[PDB]
């Protein structure tokens, strides 16, 4: 919901922020502290949350643009170089009441929360790895609050957090079909 004097862009995606640093990102706490420490180095619309894979540091050159792919045309600016970097996404996702679970492929780590509750966590650096996370429940159909963090400490980078509504038989990417930046219906 609106919570200040600034009108908010309504689009079918999450509000994306990118942060770079020349310090080491080892875990979720490090990345969250980076987010807390300054304004975003760039903003974007996260409408197709399947990013990478690439090499040679997400925070260098045009690697962020390549990583974000179809979402990079919404970047507010082209960040300068850093050694380490990551993204913070926030907004809403339409989900019917029921049981769900994430399955996430990533390098490095990440955390996804729904309605404020962590539902997928990797609190460390890693080369590309896929985790099938534990199931969670949605009590009431509608737009659920969601946020994500992901980072790259260096090297390769990928982030694809897929969701299953059918007990792990099929999974889907979070994209413009169901995302909303504000919780209003995007057209
Ligand atoms: O430790 C997390 C990183 O792992 C990889 O990078 C390490 O492993 C590579 C292959 O063994 C080495 O070449 C590299 O020097 C190591 O840092 C991965 O490539 C990174 O993206 C991960 O962040
Ligand atoms: Ca606002
Ligand atoms: Ca900030
Ligand atoms: Ca750049
Ligand atoms: Ca892509
Ligand atoms: Ca685009
Ligand atoms: Ca690093
Ligand atoms: Ca990496």
Residue numbers in the entry: 4 to 190
Question: What do the paper's sentences say?
Answer:
MpPA14 (Marinomonas primoryensis PA14 domain) lectin is a domain of a 1.5-MDa adhesin responsible for a symbiotic bacterium-diatom interaction in Antarctica. Bioinformatic analyses indicated the presence of an ∼20-kDa domain near the C terminus of MpIBP that is a member of the PA14 family, which is a carbohydrate-binding lectin module widely distributed across several kingdoms of life. PA14 domains share a β-sandwich fold and the presence of two consecutive aspartate residues in a cis peptide linkage (DcisD). The DcisD motif coordinates a Ca2+ ion that is directly involved in binding polar vicinal hydroxyl groups of various carbohydrates.
Glucose, GlcNAc, and other glucopyranose-containing carbohydrates, including 2-deoxy-glucose, methyl-α-glucose, and two disaccharides (sucrose and trehalose), all bound to the Mp-PA14-Ca1 via their trans vicinal 3,4-diols (ionic bond length, 2.5 Å) in gauche configuration with a dihedral angle of ∼60°.
